[PDB]
């Protein structure tokens, strides 16, 4: 089905403790494949997936240089943003950037992305048209004016429509063994008596990929959307993910509850029940 590639970046100033830290990672869908950390002994972009290891010296050098140039630019922007926001240089601030593309089953571009955030808040984002911008405030508007005059949107659009999707397909072909394989969740239901009057029914989903998944509990066929405890999908550490949903049920009414599981790795949605 559909696939995506994303490059995440984070720059964090630490006044009195050296230059801003820089960390960038790249993903194809939910698979991490490259990383760069300015605090590493000898900073360089490193592979984090077996299918990217084959790329030659030129690739790695270019990538490393890009990362370094980005880190430098973020440092200049953190200083600029202090002015834009009339802030002292004594505090720590954050600059985040994400960009990438989504392509459909046929390998064509579905959508492009390029958005920044300052101290956790939306700053400036390229619109889905890949030609206009959205500034979250008057400070961001200053950046918008500089980028419009310099025609940044055109450059980004050319990358997003060309290189981005071109390399994504290349990665997908090279790592097809993993990037194009869905691991369905292994599921089961646990029951934990809380007291004589009620008990916990927990629906588990383990070792699945990609992360996208839906878990829901129904009482007499009705979604318990407001009475379900759902934990954040979490990484198992081996590329797969885990997640669970729980409901506090009245003792004796356990069989009125069904857990429903949806995941691209399953031919049909699953429905589970607790076996007393």
């Amino acid at each position: 089905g559909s696939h995506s590639m994303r490059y995440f970046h984070t720059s964090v100033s630490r006044p009195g403790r050296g230059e801003p830290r820089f960390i960038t990672v790249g993903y194809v869908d939910d698979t991490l494949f490259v990383r760069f950390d300015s605090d590493a002994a000898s900073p360089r972009e490193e592979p984090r997936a077996p299918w990217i290891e084959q790329e030659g010296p030129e690739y790695w050098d270019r990538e490393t240089q890009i990362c370094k140039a980005k880190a430098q630019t973020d440092r200049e922007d953190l200083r600029t943003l202090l002015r834009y926001y009339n802030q002292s240089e004594a505090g720590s601030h954050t600059l985040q950037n994400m960009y990438g593309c989504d392509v459909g089953p046929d390998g064509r571009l579905l959508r492009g992305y390029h958005q920044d955030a300052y101290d956790g808040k939306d700053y400036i984002a390229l619109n889905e048209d890949l030609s206009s911008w959205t500034a979250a405030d008057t400070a961001a508007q200053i950046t918008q004016r500089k980028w419009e005059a310099a025609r940044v949107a055109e450059q980004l659009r050319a990358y997003l429509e060309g290189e981005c999707v071109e390399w994504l397909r290349r990665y997908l072909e090279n790592g097809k063994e993993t990037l194009q394989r869905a691991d369905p969740p292994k599921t089961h239901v646990t029951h934990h008596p809380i007291s004589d009057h009620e008990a916990t029914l927990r629906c588990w989903a383990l070792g699945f990929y990609p992360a996208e998944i839906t878990l829901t509990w129904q009482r007499d066929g009705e979604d318990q959307t407001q009475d379900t405890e759902l934990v954040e999908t979490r990484p198992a550490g081996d590329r797969t993910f885990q997640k669970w949903a729980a409901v506090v049920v009245p003792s004796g009414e356990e069989q009125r509850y069904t857990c429903h599981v949806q995941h691209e790795g399953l031919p049909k949605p699953l429905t589970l029940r607790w076996e007393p």
């Binding site: 790249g26 890009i66 922007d77 600029t80 960009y99 500089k146 990358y159």
Partner: peptide, 9 residues
Amino acid sequence: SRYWAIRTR
């Protein structure tokens, strides 16, 4: 593969 172009805010 990453985007190059260096442009400050």
